[PDB]
Amino acid sequence: VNPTVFFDIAVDGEPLGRVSFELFADKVPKTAENFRALSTGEKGFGYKGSCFHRIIPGFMCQGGDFTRHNGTGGKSIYGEKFEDENFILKHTGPGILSMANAGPNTNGSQFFICTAKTEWLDGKHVVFGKVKEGMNIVEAMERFGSRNGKTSKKITIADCGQLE
C-alpha cells in the first residue's frame, strides 16, 4: 500500500545507481504525499535534476532544494511551508528519510537520508520513509561528501518517479 519512489543518482553527470524509498503514507500521509508528488513532478515542479548540496559522511545526505540548489530554497506542494505532521517515527539508524526544516512547522521540500543513527533529531524532524533498495548507492554518495558538507563532485537526481 505504501508508495515506493526511486531516485537515479548521477555524479558529475555519470550514472551511479538507483535508490528506492518506501514512504510511510500509513503513518504520515501528508508528508509522504509531498515527497511522492515532488518525485513524480505531477504538480509541475519537483526533484528531477536537483542536487544533494550537503553530504556529511557518518551523518547524512541532504537534498531537495530544487529552487536555489544550496539549502536556502525549495517549496512543498502545499505552499512555501507546512506543519510538522507528527513525530511517531524515530531516527533509528542508517536509511531513515526525514524532513529538513528551519524551526517548528517549516517543512518545504528539503530532506535528508541518514547514514547513522541520529536520535537527537527525534521530535524535531518528521521521519517519513526509509531506503528500501540501494543503500549501497547512498553509501557510495557519502564518499563524495566532507566534514563541512561540501561535495567534491556534483551529485544529482538525474531521474525520479514512482515504482509502486
Swiss-Prot record:
Keywords: Acetylation, Apoptosis, Cytoplasm, Glycoprotein, Host-virus interaction, Isomerase, Isopeptide bond, Nucleus, Phosphoprotein, Rotamase, Secreted, Ubl conjugation. Gene3D superfamilies: Cyclophilin-like (2.40.100.10). Glycans are attached at residue 107. This is Peptidyl-prolyl cis-trans isomerase A. The modification N-acetylvaline is found at residue 1. Binds cyclosporin A (CsA). CsA mediates some of its effects via an inhibitory action on PPIase. It catalyses: [protein]-peptidylproline (omega=180) = [protein]-peptidylproline (omega=0). CDD domains: cyclophilin_ABH_like (cd01926). There is a cross-link at residue 27 (Glycyl lysine isopeptide (Lys-Gly) (interchain with G-Cter in ubiquitin)).
